[PDB]
């Protein structure tokens, strides 16, 4: 119907006006007085080797000691960062993997890819034994990210523009989130684990609520595909990190982008994003085999993490924040400090 | 009538929102990250004492054994001839694979690992990069006369960097069905009449040249061409010829004798 299109345009115009009136002083103005962080220097400690192919993901554990890797190798090595010991090395039926997760309790891991399944494995459930527990099928389109919010629940992005939620015990999908037009590319659960954000290839992230399964808010300030998003510590913001070569820090309660992290020399896209313990420092990976730290309040660079020859395809900070880890297409996983 | 009628309902759900604006939200971010600045190891160096940078010695043994089988597991993958066939989805994929759904095939001391992705959505820009390093693509566009969407994929891969060195093989499938279809209806009905002829030899060339139009046809990535039929016996033989040629070429390039 013609009116529905015109109605959509009119309500979109009014939504921006509601946003436009809300923005009185951009984030940079009030935070001008605070002393910048200053150039920080973190040098690698551990180059965890063992993968024979570019590694596409990784994840930490609440203990802040055990890692996970996923790579086209076809393996899912679980490391001990403190000693670089390959605690586990799981194979799987389909070599191709694009994500991996580590259960917050530490008894499970999940790893999906270009097969439309997020298969869970009973990591250290039986001594010297680990096997495929569940296979969550029925999720059309490739699978791009899985996350645990409890022992029995998984939120998974997909290639078919969906973020279904699962019940591992029954292996049946409970609540599905829809509304994205381009395939979803990342997740980030809130600390309270009632809300989560999903950036997709429609240049628009959306805020979902786990309980009632509705889209609370839609954010759009980007110019290309959104690749990897992290969720601000306090719970009222999240960075974006798109192929636009820039990170934008949005904030809930305002429905607007607070700041933009971009420099004219950075010419490539972004494939990973993370925050720090206090959230002050933003860490983002790039296609130019270079992760550089960002000042989340000042939008100025604060260091580089050049330790790879190929794209930095993943990175994460420990739950306690004492360390950082980056993986890359060069097939080596690095642990910084 | 109902494709975005749900979206307009959604946008109203985003409208009646109690919003605390930037002149309290920057303080919200400012207040949290200043009160928690004392506990951030990266923002502030954590004391040197707390920074660390029986079963374990056994674990050092597990790592070696785990790291041992990785080399052996990589042995098979090292000798594997990786392939993929796009074919724009619907095509003569059944016959060719018969002679992600990854089948397998071994011949003359090699281990082919054919990869077929027809179960994905049309937008493949965020996962096609996984196939960088495949030995060669195998196009098998059938002349069942999607034809158009197949050509557009040819444009993308032939002009991308990840596939700049991976050779491309092109197959024309279902020759019997194609000839039966075109013995009455000419190609010029839907294409320009540059063909000027209705046969099976020129038509195969006329379909080919459209593909040749969009390529660089470099001395390295020259396409391979052998129209194939479901009642033929030389399809796999020509695939083998092309693949062994590509392997020899990669070897020579490695030797610097290319």
């Amino acid at each position, epitope marked *: 119907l013609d009116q529905l299109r015109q109605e959509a345009e009119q309500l*979109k115009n009014q939504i921006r006006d509601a946003r436009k009136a809300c923005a009185d002083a951009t984030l940079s103005q009030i935070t001008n007085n605070i002393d910048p962080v200053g150039r920080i220097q973190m040098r690698t400690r551990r180059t965890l080797r063992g993968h024979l192919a570019k590694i596409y993901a990784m994840h930490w554990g609440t203990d802040s000691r055990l890692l996970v890797s996923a790579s086209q190798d076809g393996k899912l090595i679980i490391w001990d960062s403190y000693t670089t010991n390959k605690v586990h090395a799981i194979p799987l039926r389909s070599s191709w993997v694009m994500t991996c997760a580590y259960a917050p309790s530490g008894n499970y891991v999940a790893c999906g890819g270009l097969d439309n399944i997020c298969s869970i494995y009973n990591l250290k459930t039986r001594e010297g034994n680990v096997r495929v527990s569940r296979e969550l099928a029925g999720h059309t389109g490739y699978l791009s990210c899985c996350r645990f919010l409890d022992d029995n629940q998984i939120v998974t992005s997909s290639g078919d523009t969906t973020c279904a939620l699962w019940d591992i015990e029954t292996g049946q999908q409970t609540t599905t989130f829809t509304g994205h*037009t*381009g395939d979803v590319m990342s997740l980030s659960l809130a600390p309270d684990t009632r809300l989560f954000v999903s950036g997709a*290839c*429609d*240049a628009s992230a959306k805020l979902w609520d786990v309980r009632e399964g509705m889209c609370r808010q839609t954010f*759009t300030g980007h*110019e*290309s*595909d959104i690749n990897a998003i992290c969720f601000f510590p306090n719970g009222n913001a999240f960075a974006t990190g798109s*192929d*636009d*070569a820039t990170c934008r820090l949005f904030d809930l309660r305002a429905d607007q982008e607070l700041m933009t992290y971009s420099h004219d020399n950075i*010419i*490539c*896209g972004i494939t990973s994003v993370s925050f720090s313990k206090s959230g002050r420092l933003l860490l983002a990976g790039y296609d130019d085999f270079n992760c550089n730290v960002w000042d989340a309040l000042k939008a100025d660079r604060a260091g580089v993490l050049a330790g790879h020859d190929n794209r930095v395809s993943c990175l994460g900070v420990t739950d306690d924040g004492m360390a950082v880890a980056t993986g890359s297409w060069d097939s080596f996983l690095k642990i910084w400090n | 009538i109902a494709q975005a009628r749900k979206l307009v309902e959604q946008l109203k759900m985003e409208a009646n929102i109690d919003r605390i604006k930037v002149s309290k939200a920057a303080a919200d971010l400012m207040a949290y990250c200043e009160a928690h600045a004392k506990e951030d190891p990266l923002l502030t160096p954590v004391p040197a004492s707390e920074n660390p940078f029986a079963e374990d010695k056994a674990a050092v043994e597990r790592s070696k054994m785990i790291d041992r089988n990785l080399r052996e597991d990589g042995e098979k993958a090292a000798r594997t001839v990786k392939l993929l066939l796009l074919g724009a989805g619907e095509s003569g994929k059944s016959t060719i694979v018969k002679q992600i759904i990854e089948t397998q095939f071994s011949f003359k001391d090699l281990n082919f690992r054919m990869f077929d992705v027809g179960g994905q959505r*049309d*937008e*493949r*820009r965020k996962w*096609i990069h996984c196939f960088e390093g495949v030995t060669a693509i195998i196009f098998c566009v059938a002349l069942s006369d*999607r034809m*158009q*969407e197949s*050509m*557009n994929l040819f*444009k*993308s891969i032939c*002009n*991308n*960097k990840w596939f700049t060195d991976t050779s491309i093989i092109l197959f024309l499938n279902k020759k019997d069905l194609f000839e039966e279809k075109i013995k009455k209806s000419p190609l010029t009905d*839907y*294409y*320009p009449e540059y063909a000027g002829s209705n046969t099976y030899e020129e038509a195969g060339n006329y379909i080919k*040249v*459209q593909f040749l*139009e*969009l390529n660089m046809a470099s001395d390295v990535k020259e396409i391979y061409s052998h129209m194939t039929c479901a009642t033929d016996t030389q399809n796999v033989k020509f695939v083998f010829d092309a693949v062994t040629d590509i392997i020899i070429k990669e070897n020579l390039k490695d030797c610097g004798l290319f």
Partner: nanobody
Framework: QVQLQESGGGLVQPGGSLRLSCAASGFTFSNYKMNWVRQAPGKGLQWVSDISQSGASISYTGSVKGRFTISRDDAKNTLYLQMNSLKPADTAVYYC?????????????????????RGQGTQVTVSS
């Protein structure tokens, strides 16, 4: 919201001339490769023009050679395509497809269904 609005589509007798534009907005229309994809009756989305980022590297399909020209103008922030001596078979809905990756010549899924960076298009028509 990146928007690319087209204009100029209209009826034209065979053998004539016609130029149509694309006033983009929401992004920096200086570092994005761009295309012109048409959707003729009885066919899907086809690829025609391949204006690169610089403006010197431009490609065409065999059906379109020696007749169509494409151009960019950063100052006016618009894309330009022109059809000369067009045949009746140019009876499609020309769309203005921007490519997803800035600063690169990788135009990968511009003709795919439900793509996010091509405007609604103008119903170019050719009568007889």
């Amino acid at each position: 919201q990146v928007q690319l609005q087209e204009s100029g589509g209209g009826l034209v007798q065979p053998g004539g001339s016609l130029r149509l534009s694309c006033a983009a907005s929401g992004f920096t229309f200086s570092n994005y490769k761009m295309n012109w994809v048409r959707q003729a009756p009885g066919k899907g989305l086809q690829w025609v023009s391949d204006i690169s980022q610089s403006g010197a590297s431009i490609s065409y399909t065999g059906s379109v050679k020696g007749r169509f020209t494409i151009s960019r103008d950063d100052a006016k922030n618009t894309l330009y395509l022109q059809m000369n001596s067009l045949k009746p078979a140019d009876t499609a809905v020309y769309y203005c497809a921007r490519c997803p990756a800035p600063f690169t010549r990788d135009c990968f899924d511009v003709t795919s269904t439900a793509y996010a960076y091509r405007g609604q298009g103008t119903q170019v028509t050719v009568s007889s």
